[model samples]
Structures are given as structure tokens and as C-alpha cells.
Target: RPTFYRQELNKTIWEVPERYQNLSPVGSGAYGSVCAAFDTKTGLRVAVKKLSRPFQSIIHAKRTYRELRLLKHMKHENVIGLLDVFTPARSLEEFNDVYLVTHLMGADLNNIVKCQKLTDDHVQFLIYQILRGLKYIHSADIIHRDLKPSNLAVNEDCELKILDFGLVATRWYRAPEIMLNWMHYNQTVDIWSVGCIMAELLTGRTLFPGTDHIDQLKLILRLVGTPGAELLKKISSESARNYIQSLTQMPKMNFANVFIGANPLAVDLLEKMLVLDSDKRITAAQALAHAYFAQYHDPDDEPVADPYDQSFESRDLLIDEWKSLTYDEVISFVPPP
Candidate 1:
């Protein structure tokens, strides 16, 4: 089978099925690959992700289909959009791959944290957008198991979009609970990851900077404090209990004090999100209503400034623009450069 070839020229959107033109590889993961391409007919840029076939079972296929279904139902500013899906001609051959199409964006949250020192306002903006996205997803009873800086894409204009839904594991971002075997996890896991991302943005480092799973737990305990007995009792599994006990002497650190000049509101929100007990963790909707974002929010019909507009000394203009535009309208405009 011939591989789909992408063309860089602007041509009428051709109905060239089974052919991917001008594919510039962008990312690759354990299950698939992603690329950036241009639609000749519409002249619109799109992101193309190719999932590897022969995942070893039907379970993986079902999960992938579920993810696609979820994406189809989701339409939000912070959530990536699914444009189209197709199986490559060679999918049944030696190099079988499933293709998922989406829009193209610039840097991801991981790159932003690594390359720039984020301010309190910036952190708040990022978190607010993330919460909005997660709130929508959770409302639909979908859990994004893989919520991290690496999976979040940020365009040059500072528009943040969450990506990747491969690892929808319940305990992926949170500590093991007695309900570990419940087979059902809530939106709180995404909140936990958000807390980690917030910490990373503050310190320009990973929140759970550990070399292994044991160290990861120790790091989490250091910031959020160890789980209490009542909380531990929820983790019905003996293995989980044994692992928690191994970190008995972990130092407890105040997350607020980790940053030299962190905002009080930012710290407050982080504390609520990073609670040791998932049940006690703040929900995405609660976080949205928290006092921290209240200062940045525009409830009335007023003008607001662009969160990314760094030209003016004050963010007042940005707030004005925010107030003037509706949530849907705000997303349509490109973020200020």
C-alpha cells in the first residue's frame, strides 16, 4: 500500500480519500503518532494523529472508539477538536495506523513551563482555562486520565487546549484509594494533575520530581502531607497500604511557601486542588468559582483585556475585553501575541 502524501501548495480542498498530504510529524506516543498538515481546499491547518494498530486486543480498539465518541460530543475552547478519522490503507498491512484529525496549535504547557517563568496572573489564567475544559468533560462523565503539562497545547496567543486521552486510569494522577478496584474515577484526578501542573509552573519544575513511583508518592506527601488513616482505609488493597507505609518519614512542606513570590489566591487554589484525599479535593466547578478567579472574571457585560496582551503595563485592558466578549466569542479570537 502506498503511504498518503501531503502537499504544501494551496489547492481546492481535494476529496483525495486515503491520502494525507504535507504531513509534518509533530509528536509520537506509545500508541500512535501526530502530524501537522494543510487542507488544500480550505487552506486551513489541521493536526493529524495516527494511532498504531495491532494493539494486542479488542479492548484497546473499544477504548479508542470511546475516546473518539467523547471527542465528538465535546466542543469547548480549551478542549481540542476532532476533525475527522480514517484508517490508513495500510492499516491491515505491515504498518496499520488509524488517523485522527484536529486543529494545529503552537507550544504545549510543558514547553511553556520549561521555557518561561510564569507570573501569578499567567498561572491563574492557565488554571482557569483548564478548569473550564475539565468541568465540561467531567459534566459529561468523562475522565481524562492523562492530564499533564505535556498533553496541554498552547498556541502563540496563549490559548491552552488539553490533549491526549490514552491513559484514562483512575489512579494515574491521584493516590490509590480503597475504591481502587471500583473501576470508576471522577474528575478529581484531573484536578490533581492540574495542581501538579500549577506547582510546575510556579517553580519551573515537575511537582512530583521523583525518580520512581515510591519517590513520586513521597514528593506528593511532602507538599500535600501524608494521607490520614481514614483516607488510607479507602485503599482496600494491601499493596497500596504497604506502599503508603514505606513513606513514613516523608517531610511535609507547605505548597504555598514553595514559591518565593507566589500570589495568595494562587496558593489558596493550589492547596485546595492538591488535597491528599481525592474526595476532599476541589472540583473543577468549585475551582472556577473560587475567590482567586473572581478577581479575573467578568460577570457583567463589560470589556476585558487579553490575557496574553503583554504590551500594556496593567491587565485592565485585557479584563475589559474579557468582559465584553461571551465565553464562546472569546475563544474565536486568537489569543494576543
Candidate 2:
């Protein structure tokens, strides 16, 4: 079989050791490009992410480490699990490309929501899966910092998997605490995002739609109104609160009105989840117990993956060391196959 290697870097672009043919481009963005491919040996269709320029900066380098580390550690039905990892180069001197292989899904929630044909079952099942996924994630005391519809993968059967666990600086889907700064945040931020996604799935549009962070707060305030005393305690600073308090005083939109056609319990769950106070937000387990998910939850359904050490923050390294480590680490995790 012929192998496609980049002449400039002398790194393997497409290593066709057998028949792992990239069938079509599925998605592409800042981090890298993802494509749907077929694996001949395993007889499975897989999605591959090629991290081409990972060491452009220390931030991206660290992000690369966290993402791989987390994916390698996490094991759940709702969370995207790593299937394979590979590189084209045999030595660190020429290594530059890193590839991650995962299960191929039919489409992302962004595309699925646009279909505008989702039924109550579709909506309910999707939300249940997300919560179930979050339940597993939170049980481990981990949070999916970047939660967005596009990051959620789905198939025609209505199964959902949370993808893109790292680098979620998106404005629209980010929670209030994130804008303040993500230090010392909790699973509640993830609960807020789940509320936003649930709203989008039912309405087929963004809930707190905003172009930038400023507009984001404004949009939320216009609907959810000013923060209450208990919520303000953890939401942000006195100065930031003073600034937000200076904005127009608005009335909170009723959940039923905001998410029309949704079941009352679903709306109630939304209310519990989208509240300004992170403390007031329901835990993933509590959410699963809510009347809204009565039919979906089963105690035995919770899943846990193998235990793993999931971060690169234990030590500090220079930019050169960071580059050398990722190249070395990825290859050790999964070599060309």
C-alpha cells in the first residue's frame, strides 16, 4: 500500500499501512480537521482528528496535553472515548502531526437541531443522555469546560456523545461563571450549558444568543432578570455585579413561555438548571431524578471507565519541553496503525 507523507515536514499525512481510507471531511475548525474514514482491519467506520500545529503556543500545547489526557482517562457512553492515536514520523525530530480516532457519528447536534422534526422522544432521550453523560463526568469531579451543540455528536438513533472536552471559549454557549473566569468552578456550570442545549433542541435556536461576551450577559439578563442575593454570592465580583446591576432591570421570562411546546416538567427542569445561582442548580443525579426524566433514568445505567491520571499540570515545562513531550506522549499512547 502507498503512504502519503508531507514533503515539507517529512511527516506522515495519511499512513495507509492497510486500508484506513479517509472517506470524507466531516468537520474542521481551530484545533484541527476531522474526517470520516473506514478501517479495513476492524471493519468499522471511524472519525479521525489531525492536530497539525499543536505547539504554536504554550497554551495550545497545554490544551493538547489536557485533551489527550482526559480522553484517555474518560470512559462513558455519553463521553467520546479514544479509539486510536497515531503519528506518521518514527522520530521526534520529524514528528509534527498527531491523530485521534473515535467512533463515527451520523451528525452533530448543530445539524440535527436544524432538521426541525424532533419529537418529544427525540428531545427527551437527547437530554437524558446528556445528563447521564454529565452524571458520569461529574461523579469523577470533572467538568466539560466547552459545552456546545456542535460539540455534541448524535446518530439517527438519537444517541448523544459529548465531544470536544477542551478549548471551549465560545461566547454563546458559555456559562456565566466562565465569563467571570473559570478558576474554582464546578459541575453547575456544565448544568447551565445543558439547560442551554436543551432549550436549543426544543426551540431550534440559540437561547442566550450573543455575538460577544457583553451581549451574552445582556441577553441572559433580558430573559433571566438580575441575579438574586444567594446567586450573586458565587456568580461574580462586587465590581462586575455593580456593572451588571447598572444594566436595565428586566423581568424573568417564564420557562413555559421561553420554551413553548415543551412539557411542563421539562420547563421546570430548565428553570432549575438555568438559574443564576450555581448552588441552586440541580446536580446531574438530581436532574435525572426530576419528574422530567422519570421514564428515562435507571440506577444501573451509570457507567465508569478505567481509572487514569488525567492532567499535565503536575509539573511545569518550557515550550521546547512541551513540544517534545506531546510528540513523545501521543506516539506512546497510540502509534501508527
Candidate 3:
């Protein structure tokens, strides 16, 4: 139909609605390729992510389905909101693609951290927004699992949106609990990431740039100190616990030295946020209320959502079932301005 146009991106064809124009490649990765475009109808710039071979396996299809449902269900100013979903194919027999539309951000926090000279106020405000959004997500009983600078989009005003989910976390932001006991980790995994990101922002360097799983844990311990024997007992696997015990007990680096010249309040928040034991980690709600964000915290404006209905996540639907379900969500979506 003339209502749509096509563009070749990352060796794949993107057939998008006519309302979206001037498609420019933003980035491409294992998950999908994104493009920036202007929406004629809304007069706004937006990002469009095209899922790559989403129906290749039951696992792939399930992940895609869950991502679509969760993104549509969430509503928070600091969280990436789903604006539209579309596919070029009209019927199930032909449908093999999915496109997600979201607001186009100026840059991700990763790029901004390297290029911009942010003041203390900017760091406070940015982290405050992240926690605010996280509080809402955690209220829904969902752990973002993957919260890193590259995944966080920021605009010129320093506004932040928690982006990227469904994929596993980048190693740099991987939490200790995730490495030790992925089966039982909770929302606090994201809190660990916030601690890592905050440190990076303050220092203009990655907090833990580990080469592999072992090194990842090693780097984290070098800074946060080895977990106590009581804490080590919490690991689900005996071998994992023993491995931690074998390592030389490292003393925790002083916050003043690690985050030199950073605000004491920021350091205080980090101490609580980066606890090796998930049980002791700071909840997003507690982090938001810390003195670090006192000037910007607005309890009333920060909202929580009802628990997300995750019952469908366990379903073992066939490829055809997932295909139909995903298509239904795409066509039925009601775009917001």
C-alpha cells in the first residue's frame, strides 16, 4: 500500500507507515536495529526498533511477546513508553516482522557522560528520575534486570528514560546476585546497576569493566569488599559459595577515594545501593527518599503502579500462537499524541 514506505537498514527492509519519514540509522545490535524518524502526524521525532528474527524459537518469540506487553502496560515519565507497533505483513501467513515506536532521544546517557560536563545538580536530578521510574517498575513486580548507561536515554534537559529490557544485562552492570544466583535474584539487581552507573557518572569512567563472569565478580569485590561468610552462605550453589571464599578477602575501597570530589550524600546513597547482599540492598523507594535527592524529591509526584499480570509469561505457546498474539497487539494499539 502507498500508505507505507520501505527503507533498507542493516541488510533488512523496514516497511513503516507513511507518517514516519526521514529514517536515519541510530544503532544496530543482536536484538534489533533502531532508526530515528519524524512523525508527520504528531510533529515529533521518534525511534523505531525492528525486532530481528523474533519468531526463530519459542524462547525468542516469548521474549518478544513479553517485551511488547510490558512496554504497553507501563506508564511512567522516566520509563520508555511504547507509542506504536506495526508490521508490514497483513495476515499471519505473511507476518514476520515487528516494529516498536518510541520518542527519539537526543542521546543515551553513555554518550552524554563522556561528552558533557554535568554539575552536581544534573547528577542528582538524573539519578532521581531513574529511581522514580524504577519505583514504579518495581511496584509492578518486575525487575528491569538490564539497567545501564547505554540503555538509558537522555534528552538535552537531562531528562532520563529507563530503556532496554528482556535482554540479559551488560556485564559491566551485572549485579553480584545475578552472577551468584540468577535463579532467585530480585529487583535489587537494578539497584546495583544504579550504583555502578552513578559511580561512572561521578568519575567519567566505567565502574566495573570486567572481561568475563569471573573477572566481573572480581572487579566488583575489589571495590565493594568480599561478602562476609554469612552472606556467602546465601548463595544457592555450594560451589559458587566456595569459589567466593577462595578469593582473597578484599577490603572495601573508601567511598571518598572511589568517588573522589563527589558529594557525601551521593556516596552515602551508593553505600546502601551497592550492597553485595540483595537482602540489604536499598530499594528504589528508599533511594529516592535519600538526602542526595532532597532538593528534587517530590513524594506526591512519584507514583507506583499495580503489579503486572505475568501469568502469561510461563505459557508455552507455539510460534503461530505468538505470531497471532503479537500481531493483535500491534494493530490494536492506540497511539498517544
Q: Rank candidates, lDDT, best first.
A: 3, 2, 1
Q: List the candidate 2 regions with Cα displacement exceeding 4 Å.
A: 1-12, 165-169, 181-183, 233-236, 305-311, 334-337
Best by TM-score: 3
**Alpha-carbon error at 278 in model 1, in Å?**
1.0
Cα lDDT of all candidates, in order? 0.62, 0.75, 0.86
What lDDT is obtained when candidate 2 is compared to the true structure? Answer: 0.75
Cα lDDT tens digits, model 3, 145-211, are 8898888888887788998632223999989877677678789999999999888888788889998
lDDT per residue (tens digit) for residues 1-337 in model 2: 1354332122324542345674566657678777678877578898877775777777777777776777776678898888877677677787666778888888788877776846776788998999898888877777787788888988877788998632223677777767654555678898898988888887877888887888899898777777765655664466776776677778888878877877888899999998876656798889888888778888787664454554567677776677787776676674224
Poorly placed runs, candidate 1 (over 4 Å)? 1-21, 54-56, 88-97, 165-185, 249-252, 295-337
Per-candidate total of colliding backbone pairs: 26, 0, 0
Clashing pairs in 3: none
lDDT of model 2 at position 252:
88
What is the TM-score ranking, best to worst? 3, 2, 1
Candidate 1 Cα RMSD after full superposition onto the native fold (Å): 12.8
Better of 1 and 2 by lDDT: 2
